[PDB]
Coordinates of all heavy atoms in Angstrom, one line a residue:
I4 N 3.4 -0.6 -8.8 CA 4.3 0.2 -8.0 C 4.2 1.7 -8.4 O 4.1 2.5 -7.5 CB 5.8 -0.3 -8.3 CG1 5.9 -1.8 -7.9 CG2 6.8 0.5 -7.6 CD1 7.2 -2.4 -8.2
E5 N 4.2 1.9 -9.7 CA 4.1 3.3 -10.2 C 2.6 3.8 -9.9 O 2.5 5.0 -9.7 CB 4.4 3.4 -11.7 CG 5.7 2.7 -12.1 CD 6.9 3.5 -11.6 OE1 6.8 4.7 -11.3 OE2 8.0 2.9 -11.6
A6 N 1.7 2.9 -10.0 CA 0.3 3.3 -9.6 C 0.2 3.8 -8.2 O -0.4 4.9 -7.9 CB -0.7 2.2 -9.9
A7 N 0.8 3.1 -7.3 CA 0.8 3.5 -5.9 C 1.6 4.8 -5.7 O 1.3 5.6 -4.9 CB 1.3 2.4 -5.0
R8 N 2.7 4.9 -6.4 CA 3.5 6.1 -6.4 C 2.6 7.3 -6.8 O 2.7 8.4 -6.2 CB 4.7 6.0 -7.2
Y9 N 1.9 7.2 -7.9 CA 1.0 8.2 -8.3 C -0.1 8.5 -7.3 O -0.4 9.7 -7.0 CB 0.3 7.8 -9.7 CG -0.6 8.8 -10.3 CD1 -0.1 9.9 -11.0 CD2 -2.0 8.7 -10.2 CE1 -0.9 10.9 -11.5 CE2 -2.8 9.7 -10.7 CZ -2.3 10.7 -11.4 OH -3.1 11.7 -12.0
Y10 N -0.7 7.5 -6.7 CA -1.7 7.7 -5.7 C -1.1 8.5 -4.5 O -1.8 9.4 -3.9 CB -2.3 6.4 -5.3 CG -3.4 5.9 -6.2 CD1 -3.9 4.6 -6.1 CD2 -4.0 6.8 -7.2 CE1 -4.9 4.2 -7.0 CE2 -4.9 6.3 -8.0 CZ -5.4 5.1 -7.9 OH -6.4 4.6 -8.8
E11 N 0.1 8.1 -4.0 CA 0.7 8.8 -3.0 C 1.1 10.3 -3.4 O 1.0 11.2 -2.5 CB 2.0 8.1 -2.5 CG 1.8 6.7 -2.0 CD 2.7 6.4 -0.8 OE1 2.5 6.9 0.3 OE2 3.6 5.5 -1.0
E12 N 1.4 10.5 -4.7 CA 1.6 11.8 -5.1 C 0.3 12.7 -5.0 O 0.4 13.8 -4.6 CB 2.1 11.8 -6.6 CG 3.5 11.4 -6.8 CD 3.9 11.1 -8.2 OE1 3.0 11.3 -9.1 OE2 5.0 10.7 -8.5
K13 N -0.8 12.1 -5.3 CA -2.1 12.7 -5.0 C -2.3 12.8 -3.5 O -2.7 13.8 -2.9 CB -3.3 12.1 -5.8 CG -3.3 12.4 -7.2 CD -4.6 11.8 -7.9 CE -4.7 12.3 -9.3 NZ -6.0 11.7 -9.9
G14 N -2.1 11.6 -2.9 CA -2.3 11.5 -1.4 C -3.7 11.4 -0.9 O -3.9 11.4 0.3
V15 N -4.7 11.3 -1.8 CA -6.1 11.2 -1.4 C -6.4 9.7 -1.3 O -7.0 9.3 -0.2 CB -7.0 11.9 -2.4 CG1 -8.5 11.8 -1.9 CG2 -6.6 13.4 -2.5
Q16 N -6.1 9.0 -2.3 CA -6.4 7.5 -2.3 C -5.1 6.7 -1.9 O -4.9 5.6 -2.4 CB -6.8 7.1 -3.7 CG -8.1 7.8 -4.2 CD -8.6 7.3 -5.5 OE1 -8.1 6.2 -6.0 NE2 -9.7 7.9 -6.0
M17 N -4.3 7.3 -1.0 CA -3.0 6.7 -0.7 C -3.3 5.4 0.1 O -2.4 4.5 0.1 CB -2.2 7.7 0.1 CG -0.9 7.1 0.7 SD -0.3 8.1 2.1 CE -1.2 7.5 3.4
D18 N -4.4 5.2 0.7 CA -4.8 3.8 1.2 C -4.9 2.8 0.1 O -4.4 1.7 0.2 CB -6.1 3.9 2.0 CG -7.2 4.5 1.1 OD1 -7.0 5.3 0.3 OD2 -8.4 4.0 1.3
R19 N -5.4 3.2 -1.1 CA -5.4 2.4 -2.2 C -4.0 2.2 -2.8 O -3.7 1.2 -3.4 CB -6.4 2.9 -3.3 CG -7.8 3.2 -2.7 CD -8.7 3.9 -3.7 NE -10.0 4.2 -3.1 CZ -11.0 4.8 -3.7 NH1 -10.9 5.2 -4.9 NH2 -12.1 5.0 -3.0
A20 N -3.2 3.2 -2.6 CA -1.8 3.0 -2.9 C -1.1 2.0 -2.1 O -0.3 1.2 -2.6 CB -1.0 4.4 -2.8
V21 N -1.5 1.9 -0.8 CA -1.0 0.9 0.1 C -1.5 -0.5 -0.4 O -0.7 -1.5 -0.4 CB -1.4 1.2 1.6 CG1 -1.1 0.0 2.5 CG2 -0.8 2.5 2.0
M22 N -2.8 -0.5 -0.8 CA -3.3 -1.8 -1.3 C -2.5 -2.3 -2.5 O -2.2 -3.4 -2.6 CB -4.8 -1.6 -1.6 CG -5.6 -2.8 -2.1 SD -5.6 -4.3 -1.0 CE -4.3 -5.3 -1.6
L23 N -2.3 -1.4 -3.4 CA -1.5 -1.7 -4.6 C -0.1 -2.1 -4.3 O 0.5 -3.1 -4.9 CB -1.5 -0.5 -5.6 CG -2.8 -0.1 -6.1 CD1 -2.7 1.2 -7.0 CD2 -3.5 -1.2 -6.9
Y24 N 0.6 -1.4 -3.3 CA 1.9 -1.8 -2.9 C 1.9 -3.2 -2.3 O 2.8 -4.0 -2.6 CB 2.5 -0.9 -1.9 CG 3.1 0.4 -2.4 CD1 2.9 1.6 -1.9 CD2 4.0 0.3 -3.5 CE1 3.6 2.7 -2.4 CE2 4.6 1.4 -4.0 CZ 4.4 2.6 -3.5 OH 5.0 3.7 -4.0
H25 N 0.9 -3.6 -1.5 CA 0.7 -4.9 -1.0 C 0.6 -5.9 -2.2 O 1.1 -7.0 -2.2 CB -0.4 -5.0 -0.1 CG -0.7 -6.4 0.4 ND1 -2.0 -6.9 0.6 CD2 0.2 -7.4 0.8 CE1 -1.9 -8.1 1.0 NE2 -0.6 -8.5 1.2
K26 N -0.2 -5.5 -3.2 CA -0.5 -6.4 -4.4 C 0.8 -6.6 -5.2 O 0.9 -7.6 -5.9 CB -1.5 -5.8 -5.3 CG -3.0 -6.1 -4.8 CD -3.3 -7.6 -4.7 CE -4.7 -7.8 -4.3 NZ -5.1 -9.3 -4.3
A27 N 1.8 -5.7 -5.1 CA 3.0 -5.8 -5.8 C 4.0 -6.8 -5.1 O 5.0 -7.1 -5.8 CB 3.7 -4.4 -5.9
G28 N 3.7 -7.2 -3.9 CA 4.7 -8.0 -3.2 C 5.8 -7.2 -2.5 O 6.7 -7.9 -1.9
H29 N 5.9 -5.9 -2.7 CA 6.9 -5.1 -2.1 C 6.4 -4.6 -0.7 O 6.1 -3.5 -0.5 CB 7.2 -3.9 -3.0 CG 8.5 -3.3 -2.7 ND1 8.6 -2.2 -1.8 CD2 9.8 -3.5 -3.1 CE1 9.9 -1.8 -1.8 NE2 10.6 -2.6 -2.5
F30 N 6.3 -5.6 0.2 CA 5.7 -5.4 1.5 C 6.6 -4.4 2.4 O 6.0 -3.9 3.3 CB 5.5 -6.7 2.3 CG 5.0 -7.8 1.4 CD1 5.8 -8.8 1.0 CD2 3.7 -7.8 1.0 CE1 5.3 -9.8 0.2 CE2 3.1 -8.8 0.2 CZ 4.0 -9.8 -0.2
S31 N 7.8 -4.2 2.0 CA 8.7 -3.3 2.8 C 8.1 -1.8 2.7 O 8.1 -1.1 3.7 CB 10.1 -3.3 2.3 OG 10.2 -3.2 0.9
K32 N 7.7 -1.4 1.5 CA 7.1 -0.1 1.4 C 5.7 0.0 1.9 O 5.3 1.0 2.5 CB 7.1 0.3 -0.1 CG 7.2 1.7 -0.4 CD 8.6 2.3 -0.1 CE 8.7 3.7 -0.4 NZ 10.0 4.3 -0.1
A33 N 4.9 -1.1 1.8 CA 3.5 -1.1 2.2 C 3.3 -1.2 3.7 O 2.4 -0.6 4.3 CB 2.8 -2.2 1.6
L34 N 4.2 -1.9 4.4 CA 4.0 -2.1 5.9 C 4.1 -0.8 6.6 O 3.3 -0.5 7.5 CB 5.1 -3.1 6.4 CG 4.8 -3.6 7.8 CD1 3.6 -4.5 7.8 CD2 6.1 -4.4 8.3
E35 N 5.1 0.1 6.3 CA 5.2 1.3 7.0 C 4.0 2.2 6.8 O 3.5 2.8 7.8 CB 6.5 2.1 6.5 CG 7.8 1.2 6.6 CD 8.9 1.9 5.8 OE1 8.7 3.0 5.3 OE2 10.0 1.3 5.8
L36 N 3.5 2.3 5.6 CA 2.3 3.1 5.3 C 1.1 2.5 6.0 O 0.2 3.3 6.5 CB 2.1 3.2 3.8 CG 3.3 3.6 3.0 CD1 3.0 3.6 1.5 CD2 3.8 5.0 3.4
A37 N 1.0 1.2 6.0 CA -0.2 0.6 6.7 C -0.1 0.9 8.2 O -1.2 1.1 8.8 CB -0.2 -0.9 6.4
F38 N 1.1 0.8 8.8 CA 1.2 1.1 10.2 C 0.9 2.6 10.5 O 0.2 2.9 11.4 CB 2.6 0.8 10.7 CG 2.8 -0.5 11.3 CD1 3.5 -1.5 10.6 CD2 2.3 -0.9 12.5 CE1 3.7 -2.8 11.1 CE2 2.5 -2.1 13.0 CZ 3.2 -3.1 12.3
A39 N 1.3 3.5 9.6 CA 1.1 4.9 9.8 C -0.4 5.2 9.6 O -1.0 6.0 10.4 CB 1.9 5.7 8.7
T40 N -1.1 4.6 8.7 CA -2.5 4.9 8.5 C -3.4 4.1 9.4 O -4.7 4.4 9.4 CB -2.9 4.5 7.0 OG1 -2.7 3.1 6.8 CG2 -2.1 5.3 6.0
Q41 N -2.9 3.3 10.3 CA -3.7 2.5 11.2 C -4.8 1.6 10.5 O -6.0 1.8 10.7 CB -4.3 3.4 12.3 CG -4.8 2.6 13.5 CD -6.3 2.4 13.6 OE1 -7.1 3.3 13.1 NE2 -6.7 1.3 14.2
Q42 N -4.3 0.8 9.6 CA -5.1 -0.2 8.9 C -4.7 -1.6 9.3 O -3.9 -2.2 8.6 CB -5.0 0.1 7.4 CG -5.5 1.5 6.9 CD -5.5 1.6 5.4 OE1 -6.0 2.6 4.9 NE2 -4.9 0.7 4.7
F43 N -5.4 -2.1 10.3 CA -5.0 -3.5 10.8 C -5.4 -4.5 9.7 O -4.8 -5.6 9.7 CB -5.7 -3.7 12.1 CG -5.1 -3.1 13.3 CD1 -5.5 -1.9 13.8 CD2 -4.0 -3.8 13.9 CE1 -4.9 -1.3 14.8 CE2 -3.4 -3.2 15.1 CZ -3.8 -1.9 15.5
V44 N -6.4 -4.2 8.9 CA -6.8 -5.2 7.8 C -5.6 -5.2 6.8 O -5.1 -6.3 6.4 CB -8.0 -4.7 7.1 CG1 -8.4 -5.7 6.1 CG2 -9.2 -4.5 8.1
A45 N -5.0 -4.0 6.5 CA -3.9 -4.0 5.6 C -2.7 -4.7 6.2 O -1.9 -5.4 5.6 CB -3.6 -2.6 5.2
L46 N -2.5 -4.4 7.6 CA -1.4 -5.1 8.2 C -1.5 -6.6 8.2 O -0.5 -7.3 7.9 CB -1.3 -4.6 9.7 CG -0.9 -3.1 9.9 CD1 -0.9 -2.7 11.4 CD2 0.5 -2.9 9.3
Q47 N -2.6 -7.1 8.5 CA -2.8 -8.6 8.5 C -2.6 -9.1 7.1 O -2.0 -10.2 6.9 CB -4.2 -8.9 9.0 CG -4.4 -8.7 10.5 CD -5.7 -9.2 11.0 OE1 -6.6 -9.5 10.3 NE2 -5.8 -9.2 12.4
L48 N -3.2 -8.4 6.1 CA -3.0 -8.9 4.7 C -1.5 -8.9 4.3 O -1.1 -9.8 3.6 CB -3.8 -8.0 3.7 CG -5.4 -8.2 3.8 CD1 -6.1 -7.2 3.0 CD2 -5.8 -9.6 3.5
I49 N -0.8 -7.9 4.7 CA 0.6 -7.8 4.3 C 1.4 -8.9 5.1 O 2.2 -9.6 4.5 CB 1.2 -6.4 4.7 CG1 0.7 -5.4 3.8 CG2 2.7 -6.5 4.7 CD1 0.9 -3.9 4.3
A50 N 1.1 -9.2 6.4 CA 1.8 -10.2 7.1 C 1.5 -11.6 6.6 O 2.4 -12.4 6.5 CB 1.3 -10.1 8.6
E51 N 0.2 -11.9 6.2 CA -0.1 -13.2 5.7 C 0.6 -13.4 4.3 O 1.0 -14.5 3.9 CB -1.6 -13.4 5.6 CG -2.2 -13.9 6.9 CD -3.6 -14.4 6.8 OE1 -4.1 -14.4 5.7 OE2 -4.1 -14.9 7.8
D52 N 0.5 -12.3 3.4 CA 1.1 -12.4 2.1 C 2.5 -11.9 2.1 O 3.4 -12.5 1.6 CB 0.2 -11.6 1.1 CG -1.1 -12.1 1.0 OD1 -1.3 -13.3 1.2 OD2 -2.1 -11.4 0.6

Side-chain angles (χ1 to χ4, degrees), residues 4-7 9-52:
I4 302 179
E5 313 284 344
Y9 181 80
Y10 278 167
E11 301 216 70
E12 284 170 4
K13 287 187 170 178
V15 182
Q16 305 188 4
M17 175 200 83
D18 56 327
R19 308 173 183 180
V21 173
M22 182 56 267
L23 299 176
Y24 274 139
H25 177 220
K26 282 298 184 176
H29 198 268
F30 317 108
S31 50
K32 209 70 175 178
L34 193 68
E35 307 168 2
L36 309 179
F38 269 108
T40 59
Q41 198 257 326
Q42 295 185 173
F43 282 93
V44 185
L46 289 178
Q47 289 183 351
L48 290 174
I49 291 166
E51 278 196 356
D52 297 336

